Amino acid sequence: TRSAIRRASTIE
Amino acid sequence: ESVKEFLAKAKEDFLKKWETPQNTAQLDQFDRIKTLGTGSFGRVMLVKHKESGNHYAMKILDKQKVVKLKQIEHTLNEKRILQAVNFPFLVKLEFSFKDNSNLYMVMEYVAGGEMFSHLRRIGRFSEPHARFYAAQIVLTFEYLHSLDLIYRDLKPENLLIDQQGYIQVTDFGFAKRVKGRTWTLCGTPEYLAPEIILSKGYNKAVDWWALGVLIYEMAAGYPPFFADQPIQIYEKIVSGKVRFPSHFSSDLKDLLRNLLQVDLTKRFGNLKNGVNDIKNHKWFATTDWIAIYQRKVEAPFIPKFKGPGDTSNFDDYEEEEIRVSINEKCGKEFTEF
Ligand SMILES: Nc1ncnc2c1ncn2[C@@H]1O[C@H](COP(=O)(O)OP(=O)(O)NP(=O)(O)O)[C@@H](O)[C@H]1O
Ligand SMILES: [Mg+2]
Ligand SMILES: [Mg+2]
């Protein structure tokens, strides 16, 4: 399996 | 023009539902089955309507943390825009409601999974494969931008693949009706336009920048600007510097340079001809735009599912009890939801 790190939205 | 008349009717439909804004279901009516994705303010779960048997994806937002983090207008925007838009690549909202603790948006379940997981597994999409997904995004932005809507969080994790292999855009958390400039720092770091980072006030052009990051990541397997610390990511974005895999076509490189243009005087999608500069670009010369809209193109990849409510196309998440207080919380702040 390959890494798959989801990216979270960001606010201030 | 056929397109212009189409958009004008789309606007009429939208403004009608835009003033339709209540409580069209209740939590009681759904079995909660599995978490599909977790976020900062809650989670999305696979649910099943107990009486009809239909499955849906329910986003749960915690009202208190939403208030604490100055996200009330964003949350009201998200639900109001999702109920009023209508387009073949925008996820449908079937129900929405609120209780003592949470806001709930019940969407159609897109069982194919995130574009992100197929992309990481396959490694990278071919240029025709990437172009197929991109075409749908170009038409979607033309539609939303036509209604003065900015989307503001394009990324593979927010793009779901349906049973025909087409895209369903979800996560309208930062969508906003905007004529002119807006100023909120929001989006996802690897995808933010420079004008957002530099706090210059921005418009729909930030969506066309994000499309360039999306196309780059789909085709390369990784985004054009990434680093360990987001400060370094922002330095790259702002620098006006992008290196392309040698395996990219010259046409792909030229389109990306014009979308990843930090100068707004030059960024495609923001010039005099608007979205037509993108539609007319040589990278898209083989794209039948009407066929894509009509969903008549054979998709390059169709995910597999084993009947309704199958979740194999999603990562597994730590489950938890859904906390609903005995006392109403933040009633006044969410009256319009
Ligand atoms: N309609 C849907 N059908 C199936 N899965 C969905 C649906 N909507 C969302 N998801 C999944 O749930 C995840 C979280 O939904 P999302 O709307 O992105 O919440 P979020 O808290 O705003 N995440 P983010 O802002 O990107 O950090 C998505 O990335 C998808 O994996
Ligand atoms: Mg998301
Ligand atoms: Mg979001």
Task: Copy the structure tokens of residue B216.
Answer: 């780059």
- The alpha-helical segments, DSSP class H, found in B96-246 are 115-122, 127-146, 194-197, 205-220, 230-239
Could you list the beta-strand ranges (E) of chain B. Answer: 30-38, 42-49, 55-62, 93-98, 102-108, 149-150, 159-161, 167-169, 176-177, 186-187
Q: B134 vs B110, B126, B128, B137, B214, CA distance in Å? A: 18, 12, 10, 5, 8
Task: Copy the structure tokens of residue B309.
Answer: 């409510």
Burial B36-69 (b: 16+ CB within 10 A, else e): bbbbebbbbbbbbbeeeeebbbbbbbbbeebeee
Ligand 1 pocket (Cβ < 6 Å) reads: A 8-9; B 36-37, 39-41, 44, 57, 59, 91, 107-110, 114, 157-158, 160, 170-171, 173
Packed helices B205-220 and B250-259: angle between N→C axes, nearest 10 degrees: 150
Task: Copy the structure tokens of residue B173.
Answer: 């958390």
Task: Copy the structure tokens of residue B44.
Answer: 């999305």
Domain enclosing residue B215, as ranges: 113-295
Give me the CATH number covering residue B197: 1.10.510.10
Option in B123, B157, B188 nearest A10 (CB):
B188
The residues with which B160 forms a beta bridge, in sequence order, are B114, B168
Ligand closest to CA B40: 1
Q: Are B244 and B288 in contact (CB under 8 A)?
A: no
**B102-108, strands of its sheet edge to edge:** B30-38, B42-49, B55-62, B102-108, B93-98
Helix (H, G, I), strand (E, B) or coil at B16: helix
